Amino acid sequence: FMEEVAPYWRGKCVLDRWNAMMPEDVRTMRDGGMLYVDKKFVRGYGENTPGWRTLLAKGITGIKKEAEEKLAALDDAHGEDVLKQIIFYKSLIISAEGIIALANRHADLAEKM
Amino acid sequence: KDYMKRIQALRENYMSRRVEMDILDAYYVTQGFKATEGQPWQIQKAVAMKTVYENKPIFIQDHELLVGGVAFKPRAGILNPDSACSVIEKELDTISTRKYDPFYLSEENKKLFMEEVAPYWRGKCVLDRWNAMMPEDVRTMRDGGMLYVDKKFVRGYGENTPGWRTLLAKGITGIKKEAEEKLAALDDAHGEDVLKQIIFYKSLIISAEGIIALANRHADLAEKMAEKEADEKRRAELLKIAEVNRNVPANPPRNFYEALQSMLTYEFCIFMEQNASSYNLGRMDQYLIQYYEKDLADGTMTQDEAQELMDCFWIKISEMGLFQDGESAAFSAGYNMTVQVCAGGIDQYGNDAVNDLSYMTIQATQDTALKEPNMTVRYSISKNPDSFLRKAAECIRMGRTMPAVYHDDAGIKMLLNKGIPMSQAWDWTPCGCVETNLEGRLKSYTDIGEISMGGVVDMVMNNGRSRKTGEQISIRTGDPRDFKTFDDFMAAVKKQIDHFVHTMATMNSYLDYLSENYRPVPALSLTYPNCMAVGKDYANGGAEFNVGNGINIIGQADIINSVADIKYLVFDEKKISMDELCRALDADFEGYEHIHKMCMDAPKYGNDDPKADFCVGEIYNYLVDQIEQYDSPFGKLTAGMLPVSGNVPIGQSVGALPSGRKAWTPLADGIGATGGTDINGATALLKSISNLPHARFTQGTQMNLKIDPKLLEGERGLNSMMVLLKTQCTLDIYHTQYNVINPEILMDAQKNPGDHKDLLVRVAGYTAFFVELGKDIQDDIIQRTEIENWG
Amino acid sequence: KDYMKRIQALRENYMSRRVEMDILDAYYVTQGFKATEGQPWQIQKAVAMKTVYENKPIFIQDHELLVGGVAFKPRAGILNPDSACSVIEKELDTISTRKYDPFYLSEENKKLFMEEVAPYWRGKCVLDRWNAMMPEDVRTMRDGGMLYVDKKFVRGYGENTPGWRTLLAKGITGIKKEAEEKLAALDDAHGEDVLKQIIFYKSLIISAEGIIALANRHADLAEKMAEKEADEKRRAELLKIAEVNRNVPANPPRNFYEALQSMLTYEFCIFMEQNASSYNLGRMDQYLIQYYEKDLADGTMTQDEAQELMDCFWIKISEMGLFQDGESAAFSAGYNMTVQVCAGGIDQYGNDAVNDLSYMTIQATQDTALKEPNMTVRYSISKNPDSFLRKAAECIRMGRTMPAVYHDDAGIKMLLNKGIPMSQAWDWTPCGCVETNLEGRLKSYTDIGEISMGGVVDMVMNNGRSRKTGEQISIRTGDPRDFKTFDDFMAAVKKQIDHFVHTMATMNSYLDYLSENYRPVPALSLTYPNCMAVGKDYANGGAEFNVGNGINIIGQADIINSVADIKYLVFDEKKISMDELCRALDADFEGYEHIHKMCMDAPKYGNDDPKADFCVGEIYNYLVDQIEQYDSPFGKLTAGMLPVSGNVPIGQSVGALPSGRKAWTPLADGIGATGGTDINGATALLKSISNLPHARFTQGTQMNLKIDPKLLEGERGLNSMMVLLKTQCTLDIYHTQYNVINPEILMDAQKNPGDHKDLLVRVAGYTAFFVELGKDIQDDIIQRTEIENWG
């Protein structure tokens, strides 16, 4: 952690930004124990039910294909806002290839065993 | 004139100045960012500039009345590592002797850079983001030299006229007071959008604190210097510098002296925030008339003392120098931060705006005779006096290479075409090279990058393949021998334009993305009042008017002559087959010299020849048609024809052309004739360029003319210069500029540069020291038609 | 030219036509409405126009090659009962002999109108609504004559150029086919907003069916006439007339003959839809050139035949005569439907648009020498050939009073300032008098009412009280004896202007409200592509570009001279006390002959005198600034200076002025100088008017000149005319018009009307028959300066 992780994220992670940006009335009330304010800065969203029906009806490959197609319809010549969508779809595609990889490593492990 | 003694001294000190790379600025920005890790980039960036203002070295040179700097020395290039940090890291060891616009980078500053700056900014500066994100069509097109797409990723916004009237009216303190007011009114409990406004206002306030500090630091310095100063005349002017700098730009100027220093300090500050061209002073003759007139009336100042002050202002302005990477430097050569000040035009009643300041703005250029500021005249033929056009003609005749003369109404039309109402468009300011701006109110990149119209003809002729490398650089619009009619050839041209424009628009999305996220300019946003109203940086559309960024177009004469000459030679005369033409074109004309002479003799744009000019309106309205279909958060993209020096580098990518152009030579400068192909006089050349739809190109149009000096001798020569200039307005030509130089002086400058260090030449919308240009740019200039007849 | 035999005959037919009042149109419109009770206004209007189109009597006159009309006979004014029913009722027994534009109302048409028409429309037509609703601030300014407000409530939209290109390329069936397809693709289950769309498309379909019904009736009538025609030549024309009216406007014209009939049939149907001025043909020369050139290639038509058709067309167009109430008539005299058609300008590539038809456009006017069309020249000095300019000048010299010459770039600037992109503004068309339009794409009332600038000045001098009645009719700006300086005087003029403009803005709110509800124009919407794309009528923002309505401004030289002369007399020269001045103004200079001689001798607008012209830009930028602060559903209001003939009526409410103008005489026409005060030549006159900010008046400016015929003799006189017109462009002057007429003729035309029934005069943006103008308007024209010096 200390050698390969900690230095990269100092001032970068969400909790560091929170501590850097915390307004003072917020600080006072948190220091006074009147509010508690930190835990969603520490840990991501959670607190949702994802689209299980979507996962099941389409699988990650179906979703990734919708994203490949939405991405292919889009044109980054059409301005920054399209660019932001292209980035999002790219990110769905990347992240979806990763999920599938992890499922397959397990499959690989089970076959080796 | 007495004050000229001082001006000559300041000039001599400017000339003896080596161009050096500044790094302290970059170092202090880095400290600022590190000092605020985890804060919003707008806070980080404002604190960094406050760190720069509070800490940079400052100086007050001998004889200076106006004081300041962007760096630790005059003419020093600053590095904004939030933008172009990898540039200095890639040419750490070559920048001192690189082909174009070298900067002496001390061994000291290399170590500061490599140790204290470069590490923090890897993968973080705008340039590194772009290199990371560049889509492949852009990289393919760029690598094949059909586009230049890197300029604005390297160097900040620039390309705008700050709100000089707000800074003069309120001072930096009044503005910060307003931001403080806005900030107190806002509540961070009212959601993320309000927090964004809070951040921006906080970032405005830090910036404002920084700027006032830097002005106070100079006052402190002048104070201490004056105690130390034996000469009672200098001591007096030093204590005056102390009082002036204490007042502005914190407070509204009290007099002409202070108004000048106010602009100068702010000009330096916004420049330090982002190295970039075109931080236009704009209409100083309008902004400062109130203080000049008050002082003359009061006795507190004389007209000659005002000229003296303006002359020093000119010299201080000239002590900035655009920094950029070595490639971009061939496209933007001579350290042309290109700070356009202008004179003339109309007032808010549409009346003639020419006043004493107008004349003295010209007189500051004649006196000081440096490459900057880029001093030009909004010339209203319907309203401005002959005497004012005359003084401009005399300035030109002196070889000052300025002013550039704008047809005022063309400039107004361009602002209307930008969506600005006429109630404000009378007040337009020419920008940087030849673009159009509006004091404190219009936001745009006026030049994101360059399309090579020459490339467009090469892609048609070589079916999308680089003649240099052979790779498929563009789309395949077909084998040119399959073109049955000239219409099929023209279809090919048009498809290629779609691709070049589409690719530039692709690039524009990344640029607007990276800019909005990583190029907040709060110091600049201080002087855009609408930014205060809506709580958004200049970068995020806070300005009153936003338009789409400008696509720049290089090679008018090359595209126009190749189209005309292909129609003429292949399709109407049938002097040669398409096949033979292509072979001639592949051979670079070696072994086909009768074909070359046939190409050279075919109609040439610039002669009022209809066989050459019939196509100009179609190609360039088509081109602008493509550009404008692309939308951004800031509006539909705009277009300009301000090649800068980029015609020289961008031509190295373009093979031989049907116009007779041999491979890898320069494309034509500006919108004018290829060198030596216009031989019908000035007037005929203007007629040819009037075929361009200037008003379609809202980022401006840049024309060169090189006049034989004998044509300007005597009052007869002057009248003829004015007739030509009036002719330009009549023909609706946006812009013209004049080199007037004995051509042996330019050739001697190549061989004995040491004896021509202040030799000025007009390159493309801006002036440069001739010996300071890469030889190819020098040769481009040399070979321009010396125009021997007025017409 | 042989074909001139048919044009002479057609022209003799037109010149002997008595001007009558049609009622059948109003009767059938009342029927259509009765037959549609419970239906939306838009369906009613549409069905009422089917009924008008399918039932009104039609005619085919001897020698006519093109056919149609808007009423039971040529030159009849029609009654759109839906807009102005109550005017025919109030003037039922006076209209046949009223002072301005009499319309002989047959006793029989009186009876049909009163029994079947008037009852239905009381409290129903827009004029009735406006009177019900007219707020009291409008009433008491209208009363007392400060504003004229009633025009556009009486007379439908007009002032626009329909989508000629859409009609010509698609035909009314093509468009109906689109409306039908949009209709089929909408589901009225999707809510009130869609039903509105559906309602609108239906109204288009119904309109479109009626216009093809009308054309076919003409083809039918022609074939029946053919059956009874002995001469085979005439019989063969009638058969051709039948063939073309079966095709157009239903289908795209197969030839130039068919294209002319197409526009004309359509032009008559949109005039029938609403009596209104300035349904402009626009750029005929560009819309029809490919028909003319294809037809000439095919041997199916000669340039001579093309000229003859156009001459026919010119006469046909002349056969409309604008209708309005007795009082509106004083403001717009001469039956001035102002159907403008311009040649020249630049094409879509920015190139010279002049072609054969551009010359034949001028030629037709010269051939037909009638009051309409309002033939005008878009003149681009940088692009249009001199040959074109000289033809225009040759036509002006003949006494045709046309064309009006527009500086093309100024026309473009106004469209840009309306927010039209330069990609479409090259395509502007002068409108009605001198307003700006864009073919099938721009919606606005270009002239809703008139501000009396005279009245403004009278209101300062008399502290907002009428000189006629003594009533308080405007706001209070202070006793003028209390204005210590010219600045307080100017401040009061501004305050008056604020209130006038405010009250015009108030009336505009009512006009839009009534317009949008009770003035759908389905016929007109057929040729606005965007109404089809959004499914809203022209009247509901369907057009591609909407600007707010245009406030008209009358009395330029009057407020300028009064402002200038107050300043010279009371404040600079102090040779007359403000009280002395007011006492003399209250007296109408009666017994103050010395003061009146001093005011006559104070500087006069129109002489290029800075003592007079110093205030022009400031007052008129203030004015447009005021107008422009007001928004509507269609954009900010717009402004124009096209007084029409309203300077004569509006002047009857203005007492004497410090400019020396006696009480209740006409104000100055257009934007030029007061008769008999411009003594410095035409060029100085043009220089004075160049101080107006023509750009800011997006609804145009109208300039009259009257040139001593002797000034135009021979090739030199034409030369001087052309130089004058180039000076016009140099000075950025939007518009000029030329009366060229021996003065005796005018005066004989007052003694012997019957010896001069075709004597044309240029009035103010348009041409009238001099003998059809009320004497006091004739006198105004007569006292115009006969410029005897070009300058």
Ligand SMILES: CN1C[C@H](O)C[C@@H]1C(=O)O
């Ligand atoms: C020197 N600059 C002037 C214009 O702003 C464009 C040019 C650049 O950015 O290279």
Ligand SMILES: CN1C[C@H](O)C[C@@H]1C(=O)O
């Ligand atoms: C003569 N018309 C031209 C203008 O558009 C309006 C005017 C009218 O009739 O009111």
